[PDB]
């Protein structure tokens, strides 16, 4: 039996996720059967098909009527209610909700989907509070099928955590600092405008915009040995997609740039295959659009000082790569579903 | 004495208007005493001072507390209610509301301010329905002092109408088409996202985005002879401010480019001084930031074919120039107050 999926929030992640699933549908244990979003089916179908970042969807015809969108004749029922407690999850037999609105990231918020009848919720963002958090390739095998609410962390945590795991196991991470130079996202204003966060208020395509981030601390949730040992910040810049993590760590075992690169290369060919990609090419952000890895190490930028201070730099497609991981986590949950 | 003003909607136009007034307040019949906006005084003061387009406000100190913002010791009371019927206009003695939210552009909507206690409303946008519409330099002297709700039209109408009036009086406009190549504005989405207008839904800093516009037809409101004779469109492009109108007219009296330019230059020195500026310089959009004219004719671009087909091109600072005209109209109302 297929696991019946509803997407709550048909935004950048909701629609990237839908496209990821449509391309991977033949091997899937999931069936996307419903969407809840602020807009109507005709708008959802238009935005699913016509994407400024991904291009026109090529694989199947996308159409809509008053009640549904259709992808290759396969119907996805649509509803529009901003209160999840009202959603038709029991009526639609929903097993798993992909919670992609950005606003139900606490247990109390995400549990509204359970009240409405869904069996499980996967939050496409860091959880607030005591929500189990997973990074595919780092700790997803610790997933417990009895858990009803899980988090797939953030794009940045999914890029950083695999690299941190490899470096920690090879050299022993004592402390580490991160900065993500990140494409702007939909929480920032287009022109300077009211916002409870004075930096997100500022014109996103005109500015380098710092924000705090929990992404580095969150690596301690998925690598518990490093709880409290990592911190960092974000700088949002005027690109619409693709981001880069710069990580500086104090390590126990002395090393040099060549060894750091070799360890990550070896992991990318074996234990982290499909999660970390190792690149010796001199590329730029646009070249990583649509990359399926969580982290692409830019080997040319690795440097070490004094044996013990290590800098690595890794690219990530924050929309598409992260959505591939959301789908991987959902397929893992389906494979272990009781 | 002074006409007491409240700004409803402290956005791009609301804040540009405030800065225009702060620079011109020594000769003003207006006193800005109140602001209503979705956000709080701290946020209002921060965004008034720090502006990605205008730079840091230079003329006076800008501070805030829980209740007010302060500009050079002048206290401006603040409130946050999205329903204008609840606003404290009676208690604050508000005479004139600057309606800059973008959402109360019908008489029914704008009249909510009158119910709350204000005496007049100036809508910083085209009106919807039967609202008297003014363009300073074109028809503002026709202001009827008994009117309670007026419109200052749009930025594009304020740029186009003065040029159209000059061309009509010199050559007789029979028909005309307009395209504005316009900076993106806050009604467009930063990344592709739900919108009832499928083109406004698309990533604004990544795309050329066509939108319909009423600006050409609205010239027929301020030049009644030309009702029904003009039409056009907008192309929103990835600049955050400053726009350009391209106007192609069919005229009755045959002419040539040199004569079209001479007529507009003469008007810019006399009847349209301060409204139209005549430029023979080879400049680009950034050079027109902060220009006080409604329309800057780019004389090098004028062309005529066959005597009767005239093309003119004019720049405008859609935020600052338009806000100067809002202030001019408000001052005109204050000087003709009933």
């Amino acid at each position: 039996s297929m696991v019946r999926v509803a997407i709550n929030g048909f935004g950048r992640i909701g629609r990237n996720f839908m496209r990821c699933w449509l391309q991977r549908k033949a091997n899937s244990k999931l069936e996307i059967v419903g969407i809840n979003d602020t807009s109507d089916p005709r708008t959802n179908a238009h935005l699913l098909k016509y994407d400024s970042m991904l291009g026109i969807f090529q694989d199947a015809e996308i159409t809509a009527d008053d009640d549904c969108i259709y992808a290759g004749g396969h119907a996805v029922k649509c509803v529009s209610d901003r209160n999840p407690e009202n959603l038709p999850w029991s009526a639609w037999g929903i097993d798993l909700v992909i919670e992609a609105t950005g606003v139900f990231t606490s247990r109390e918020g995400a549990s509204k989907h359970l009240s409405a009848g869904a069996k499980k919720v996967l939050i496409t963002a860091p959880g607030k509070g005591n929500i189990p958090t997973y990074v595919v390739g780092v700790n997803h095998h610790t997933y417990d099928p009895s858990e009803d609410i899980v988090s797939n962390a953030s794009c940045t945590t999914n890029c950083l955590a695999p690299i941190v795991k490899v470096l920690h196991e090879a050299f022993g991470i004592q402390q580490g600092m991160m900065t993500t130079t990140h494409s702007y996202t939909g929480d920032q204003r287009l022109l300077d405008a009211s916002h409870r966060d004075l930096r997100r208020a500022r014109a996103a395509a005109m500015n380098i915009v710092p924000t705090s981030t929990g992404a580095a601390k969150a690596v301690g949730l998925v690598i518990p040995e490093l709880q409290g040992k990592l911190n960092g910040i974000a700088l949002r810049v005027p690109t619409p997609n693709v981001s880069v993590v710069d990580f500086v760590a104090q390590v126990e075992k002395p090393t040099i740039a060549e060894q750091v690169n070799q360890v990550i290369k070896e992991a990318s060919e074996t234990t982290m295959k499909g999660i970390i990609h190792y690149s010796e090419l001199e590329l730029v952000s646009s070249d990583y659009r649509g990359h399926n890895a969580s982290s692409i190490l830019d080997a040319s930028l690795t440097m070490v000082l004094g044996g013990n201070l290590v800098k690595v730099v890794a690219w990530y497609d924050n929309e598409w790569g992260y959505s591939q991981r959301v789908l991987d986590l959902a397929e893992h949950m389906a494979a272990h579903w009781a | 004495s002074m006409v007491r003003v409240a700004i409803n909607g402290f956005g791009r136009i609301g804040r540009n208007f405030m800065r225009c007034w702060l620079q011109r307040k020594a000769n003003s019949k207006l006193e800005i005493v109140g602001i209503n906006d979705t956000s709080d005084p701290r946020t209002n003061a921060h965004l008034l001072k720090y502006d990605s387009m205008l730079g840091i406000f230079q003329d006076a100190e800008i501070t805030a507390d829980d209740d007010c913002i302060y500009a050079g010791g002048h206290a401006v009371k603040c409130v946050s209610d999205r329903n204008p019927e609840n606003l404290p206009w009676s208690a604050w003695g508000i005479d004139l509301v600057i309606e800059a939210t973008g959402v109360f552009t019908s008489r029914e909507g704008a009249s909510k301010h009158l119910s709350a206690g204000a005496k007049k409303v100036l809508i910083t946008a085209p009106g919807k329905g039967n609202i008297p519409t003014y363009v300073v330099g074109v028809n503002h002297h026709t202001y009827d002092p008994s009117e309670d709700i007026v419109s200052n039209a749009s930025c594009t109408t304020n740029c186009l109408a003065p040029i159209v009036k000059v061309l009509h009086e010199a050559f007789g406009i029979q028909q005309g088409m307009m395209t504005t190549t316009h900076s993106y504005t806050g009604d467009q989405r930063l990344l592709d996202a739900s919108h009832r207008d499928l083109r406004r839904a698309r990533a604004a800093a990544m795309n050329i985005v066509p939108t319909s516009t009423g600006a050409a037809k609205a010239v027929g409101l301020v030049i009644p002879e030309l009702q029904g004779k003009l039409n056009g469109i907008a192309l929103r492009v990835p600049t955050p401010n400053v726009s350009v109108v391209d106007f192609v007219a069919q005229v009755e009296k045959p002419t040539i480019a040199e004569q079209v330019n001479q007529v507009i230059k003469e008007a810019s020195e006399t009847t349209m001084k301060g409204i139209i500026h005549y430029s023979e310089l080879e400049l680009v959009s950034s050079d027109y930031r902060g220009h006080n004219a409604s329309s800057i004719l780019d004389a090098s671009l004028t062309m005529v074919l066959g005597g009767n087909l005239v093309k003119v091109v004019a720049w405008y600072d859609n935020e600052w120039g338009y806000s100067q005209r809002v202030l001019d109209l408000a001052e005109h109302m204050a000087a003709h107050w009933a």
Partner: peptide, 22 residues
């Protein structure tokens, strides 16, 4: 508690309120 704080509690997806932890 301010009106703006209540607005963002009631409408966390509103443009004045969104906080995505990138």
């Amino acid at each position: 508690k301010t009106s703006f704080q209540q607005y963002c509690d009631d409408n966390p997806d509103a443009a004045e309120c969104r906080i995505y932890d990138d």
